[PDB]
Amino acid sequence: GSHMLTSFQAMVELKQKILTSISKLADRDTYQIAVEDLEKTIQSLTPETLPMFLNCLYDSCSDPKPAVKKECLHLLSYVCSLHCDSTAAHLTKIIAQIVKRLKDSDSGVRDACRDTIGALSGIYLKGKEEGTNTGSASLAVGLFVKPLFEAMGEQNKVVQSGASMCMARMVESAASPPVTSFQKLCPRICKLLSNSSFLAKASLLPVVSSLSQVGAIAPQSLESLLESIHDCLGSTDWVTRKAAAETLTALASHSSGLIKEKTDSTITVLETCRFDKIKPVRESVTEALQLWKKISGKY
Numbered sequence: 001g002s003h004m005l006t007s008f009q010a011m012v013e014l015k016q017k018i019l020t021s022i023s024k025l026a027d028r029d030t031y032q033i034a035v036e037d038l039e040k041t042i043q044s045l046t047p048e049t050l051p052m053f054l055n056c057l058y059d060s061c062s063d064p065k066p067a068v069k070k071e072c073l074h075l076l077s078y079v080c081s082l083h084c085d086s087t088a089a090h091l092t093k094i095i096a097q098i099v100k101r102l103k104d105s106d107s108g109v110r111d112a113c114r115d116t117i118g119a120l121s122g123i124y125l126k127g128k129e130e131g132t133n134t135g136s137a138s139l140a141v142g143l144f145v146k147p148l149f150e151a152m153g154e155q156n157k158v159v160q161s162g163a164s165m166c167m168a169r170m171v172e173s174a175a176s177p178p179v180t181s182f183q184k185l186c187p188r189i190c191k192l193l194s195n196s197s198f199l200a201k202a203s204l205l206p207v208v209s210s211l212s213q214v215g216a217i218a219p220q221s222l223e224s225l226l227e228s229i230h231d232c233l234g235s236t237d238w239v240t241r242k243a244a245a246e247t248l249t250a251l252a253s254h255s256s257g258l259i260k261e262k263t264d265s266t267i268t269v270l271e272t273c274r275f276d277k278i279k280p281v282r283e284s285v286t287e288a289l290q291l292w293k294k295i296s297g298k299y
Contacts, residue, residue: 011052017041018056022072026065035071042079050086053079058097066106073098073112077119084123091124091143099147102162110162117144117166118173125170129178141181144170149188152198160200164207171210182216190221193228201232205243209250217255223262230269233285238278245270245284252291263296 018041024034045053057079061072076094080087087094098113121144128137144167151163171182189207192198208225211217217225232244248266251259259266270289276282 011049014041014049015052015056018053019060022056022060022068025071026063026068031067038075039078042075042082045079045083045086047086050079050083051090054087054090054093058093061097061101066104066109069101069104069106070108070112073101073109073116077116080120080123088124091120095120095143095147098166099151099163102151102166103156103159105158110165113162114165114169118169120144121170121173122175125173125178126175128174128176129180130176134180137178137181138184141178141184145185152192152200152204155197157199160198161203164200164203168203168207168210171207171214171216174214177214177216179214179216182211182214183218185211185216186218186221186225190224190228194224194231201235202237202240202243205229205232205240205247209247212247212251212254215254217251217258219258222255222258226262226266230266233269233273238276238281241273241276241278241281242284245273245281245288248288249284249291252288252295256295259292260295263292267292267296 018038021034021037021041024030025038041053054076057072057075061069063069063072076097080091080094095117098116101109101113104110124140125137125144128140148163148167148170151159154160167185171177171185174182185207189204189211192204193201193208198204208217208229229244229247232240232247235241235244248270267289270285270292273285274282274289276285
């Protein structure tokens with residue numbers, strides 16, 4: 001009756017203001033004051049006025065003008081930074097909107113996607129593995145990896161590349177990284193790197209490098225990982241070969257104790273690849289070969 005109608009009027013007025021500021025973001029001189037107005041509205045959000053702002057951002061994330069999309073992704077980040085406990089429930093829809101935006105070719109849009117994924121990981125994946133229970137960590141990491149792997153399943157190299165960059169940034173952005181929950185990514189990344197349909201292996205190898213940096217390499221999948229990296233060293237794209245060499249470098253540099261025994265096959269493949277016609281490939285192969293030789297002991 002009266003209370004429902006009053007809440008309706010308040011909600012519609014707030015949506016009016018939000019959409020007006022978001023549309024005015026599209027202008028160059030009316031961009032900064034609109035940013036300030038949207039931030040001031042973010043500050044005064046409550047658990048009931050939060051989902052309406054999120055729905056505004058969602059419906060605004062599809063505007064053709066790319067600056068609007070970039071700022072809406074940054075606003076998703078901002079609202080998660082200012083109301084993390086309140087947005088932990090809508091995290092799923094948020095990550096879904098980011099994965100939907102992964103298909104854009106605009107550099108700024110893809111960079112905003114990666115930065116938003118990183119901010120979300122830094123907020124919700126920090127310290128998620130401190131104690132005896134390991135259930136909230138699994139759910140948290142899954143909220144990120146399930147849509148990312150689904151986007152990696154699409155037949156679009158742009159989307160696969162974006163998904164891989166976002167997954168790498170997610171692994172990198174966790175302060176106290178959930179290593180056990182992050183190790184669940186290796187058995188799928190192996191199959192993706194061995195898959196011929198996957199077209200963004202050069203973007204997925206840095207994900208392996210990042211997993212090695214935080215020490216989240218699954219030892220039961222390490223041999224298949226090395227096999228897929230050898231395959232990538234065998235690729236026709238020089239970028240993929242250089243990326244595989246640099247991932248071998250990262251593995252020797254951060255998973256040193258994990259690869260001590262299994263070096264000879266990787267060293268042999270590097271020996272066969274040290275005379276690549278592409279000079280950057282030559283240099284990366286030489287670097288990885290020296291590192292693995294020193295880890296093993298050829299002196």
